Design a protein around this ligand. Structure first.
Ligand code: HEM
Length: 405
């Protein structure tokens, strides 16, 4: 279903890429998106799928657009338009200088100092989860570790019950990888229906949890409104439940297929931090965009006010002009360049937490289960969207080769 080409779009710039269902998906989601960087594809193209929008395919252009909020506004960051319009999360749906005040508050709840204080908890849960799996000799990584590990840590930080995870998770997934079961507006309403009562309570009887902190925070001298707190917690929910969760699976899927890379990390632990950056580059998974605030000629192409443009954070590090042999995983790259956590004023505030969770997982897993592989016959399937993911990841190993710690 392609949308009619708008008058200002030159047909030689047309390339019908569907971000929710790319063509070479079977080859891997990152590989599927990388077709946009083939020699036959211009740096800036227009796709008629999902309503019609531009797509910047090079790291240089993606960075430029993200730095220039004057022309590319965050007001409508999601494609399709209906999604971008129903999208009202703070601070992502705001442009500076407005964004700055809310960003400061959000940093208060997921910033570095918070990660430092939760460190022992993150480590305890990781060790506990892995030790429990170790003797089984098999598991579905996605549901057995990738989901429980990061999500339980977030629920702990947010002070929310573990019983609500299945419900909250489903709603979140509908926003990043639409099933077709419900519209973005409906999924958002549902999520807000959940948060509203909680924020109300946390406003009267404040706690030490992230929500209590946000609900009673101060913005620009004055206090945050109920509506504002609601829209910020909504974003925190999506970030805590659908980012690290998917990234861990891409990484584990790769480690299960490359004994050499596992060995490398086991023998030279001082390389884990670097390996983390390289994996964040190779398995980048986020792709959202901006909306043109006015007519603007960008790198020779005429963009029209109201035009939406997808700026795939995932593509920057896969661009060969940025990283030689982009598809190759090399832990000793002299320079790992990517924009996996974003670029510009909207740089991910939860990246410190994410990096901590990734590093702990790699270290603690490889310590107890150094040898593992993908279950014979299993076909790993990826899913594309605002945040890409893995359907399932069946793993198997010989318990006799594991190490209890
Ligand atoms: C591998 C994990 C993650 C990735 C790749 C990731 C990626 C991103 C990206 C690309 C943006 C910018 C979006 C834009 O410019 O429109 C962003 C923003 C943000 N992320 Fe993350 N994120 C991750 C984990 C998290 C976590 C764990 C949280 C915490 C709940 C979170 C909280 C935030 C916040 C608060 C923002 C908005 C910042 C602002 O608009 O000023 N993220 N993230």
């Amino acid at each position: 279903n392609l949308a009619p080409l708008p008058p200002h779009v030159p047909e030689h710039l047309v390339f019908d890429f569907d971000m929710y269902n790319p063509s070479n998906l079977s080859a891997g989601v990152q590989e599927a998106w990388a077709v946009l960087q083939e020699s036959n594809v211009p740096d800036l193209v227009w796709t008629r799928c999902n309503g019609g929008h531009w797509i910047a395919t090079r790291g240089q252009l993606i960075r430029e657009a993200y730095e220039d909020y004057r022309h590319f506004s965050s007001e409508c960051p999601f494609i399709p338009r209906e999604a971008g319009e129903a999208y009202d999360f703070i601070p992502t749906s705001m442009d500076p200088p407005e964004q700055r005040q809310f960003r400061a508050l959000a940093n208060q709840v997921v910033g570095m100092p918070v990660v430092d204080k939760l460190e022992n908890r993150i480590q305890e849960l990781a060790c506990s989860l892995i030790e429990s799996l170790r003797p089984q000799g098999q598991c579905n990584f996605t549901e057995d570790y990738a989901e429980p590990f990061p999500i339980r840590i977030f629920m702990l930080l947010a002070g929310l019950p573990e019983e609500d995870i299945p419900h909250l998770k489903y709603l979140t997934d509908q926003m990043t990888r639409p099933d077709g079961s419900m519209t973005f507006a409906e999924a958002k309403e549902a999520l807000y229906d959940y948060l509203i009562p909680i924020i109300e309570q946390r406003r009267q009887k404040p706690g030490t949890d992230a929500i209590s902190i946000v609900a009673n925070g101060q913005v620009n001298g004055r206090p945050i409104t109920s509506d504002e707190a609601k829209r910020m917690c909504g974003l925190l929910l999506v970030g805590g439940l659908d980012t690290v969760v998917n990234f861990l699976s891409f990484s584990m899927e790769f480690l299960a297929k490359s004994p050499e890379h596992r060995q490398e990390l086991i023998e030279r632990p001082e390389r884990i931090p670097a390996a983390c950056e390289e994996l964040l580059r190779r398995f980048s998974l986020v792709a959202d965009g901006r909306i043109l605030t006015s007519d603007y000629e960008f790198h020779g192409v005429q963009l029209k006010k109201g035009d939406q443009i997808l700026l795939p954070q995932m593509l920057s590090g896969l661009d060969e002009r940025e990283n030689a042999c982009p598809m190759h995983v090399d832990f000793s790259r002299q320079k790992v360049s990517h924009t996996t956590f974003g670029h510009g004023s909207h740089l991910c505030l939860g990246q410190h937490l994410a990096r901590r969770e990734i590093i702990v997982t790699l270290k603690e897993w490889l310590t107890r289960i150094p040898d593992f592989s993908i279950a014979p016959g299993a076909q790993i399937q990826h899913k594309s969207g605002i945040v890409s993911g893995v359907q399932a990841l069946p793993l198997v190993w010989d318990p006799a080769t594991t190490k209890a710690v």
